[PDB]
Amino acid sequence: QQEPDRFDRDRLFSVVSRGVPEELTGLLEYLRWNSKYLTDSAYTEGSTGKTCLMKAVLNLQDGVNACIMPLLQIDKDSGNPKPLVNAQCTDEFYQGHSALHIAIEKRSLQCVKLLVENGADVHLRACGRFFQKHQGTCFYFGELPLSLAACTKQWDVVTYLLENPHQPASLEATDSLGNTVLHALVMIADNSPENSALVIHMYDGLLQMGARLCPTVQLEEISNHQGLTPLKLAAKEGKIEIFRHILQREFS
Numbered sequence: 001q002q003e004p005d006r007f008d009r010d011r012l013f014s015v016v017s018r019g020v021p022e023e024l025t026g027l028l029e030y031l032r033w034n035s036k037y038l039t040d041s042a043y044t045e046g047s048t049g050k051t052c053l054m055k056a057v058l059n060l061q062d063g064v065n066a067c068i069m070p071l072l073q074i075d076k077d078s079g080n081p082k083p084l085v086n087a088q089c090t091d092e093f094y095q096g097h098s099a100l101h102i103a104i105e106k107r108s109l110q111c112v113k114l115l116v117e118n119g120a121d122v123h124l125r126a127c128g129r130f131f132q133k134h135q136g137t138c139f140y141f142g143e144l145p146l147s148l149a150a151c152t153k154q155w156d157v158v159t160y161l162l163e164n165p166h167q168p169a170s171l172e173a174t175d176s177l178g179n180t181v182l183h184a185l186v187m188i189a190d191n192s193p194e195n196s197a198l199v200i201h202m203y204d205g206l207l208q209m210g211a212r213l214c215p216t217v218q219l220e221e222i223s224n225h226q227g228l229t230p231l232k233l234a235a236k237e238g239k240i241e242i243f244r245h246i247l248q249r250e251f252s
Contacts, residue, residue, distance in 0.1 A: 004029040009043050016056040021070040028074050037080040039087050051087045057099045063108040072118045085120045093136040096126045104148050109156050122169040128176045142184025143175040150181050150202055151188040162209050171210055178225035186234045189242055196241040
């Protein structure tokens with residue numbers, strides 16, 4: 001008894017950035033003694049700021065951080081009602097970013113898997129506050145982890161987000177503009193011959209999965225906040241090439 005050693009934020013962030021989990025011993029003991037969680041202001045860069053898990057994901061080696069599992073375990077064992085996994089960062093650079101968003105943004109499937117396997121909400125919303133404003137690291141990708149993976153051309157990630165048995169991500173989910181992943185692709189698309197080809201490939205792939213995962217729901221008839229289906233939006237936005245593609249699919 002009569003313990004345990006102080007484990008401040010500075011030290012925790014140093015260890016998670018380097019990657020070695022063996023130096024996290026004593027953290028659980030301290031947290032529990034003082035009834036503290038890794039989501040408290042004391043352990044984040046300002047209340048509402050980076051959690052230690054986001055710091056872990058921001059420092060990848062080979063696509064993984066060996067701290068992520070130990071960290072998510074410590075949080076579980078500490079009795080946190082609001083799991084560290086679903087915490088969202090919101091500072092000068094980030095806006096509603098979960099570790100999941102960062103994991104997808106860092107193009108790491110093994111890290112995405114790892115997070116989803118430990119109760120990550122695949123429906124948290126990032127970059128909702130900023131809409132064609134150049135402020136932080138935020139851009140429009142449709143503010144949904146699935147949309148992000150699709151807009152960033154990561155099929156293997158899209159595949160896993162839709163199929164995994166832990167937390168499947170619905171294709172029917174919409175962002176603050178009522179925009180589905182299909183809408184987001186139309187938006188994200190420039191009218192380059194190379195880019196349009198890749199967006200079409202991704203677009204089609206999701207409808208294939210649409211037929212398998214939600215066969216009853218006609219994804220392409222889903223209208224957004226301005227009363228636009230992906231077809232209508234494609235015309236409004238002047239994205240001629242992919243508008244030409246959605247058109248043909250309708251006339252079959």
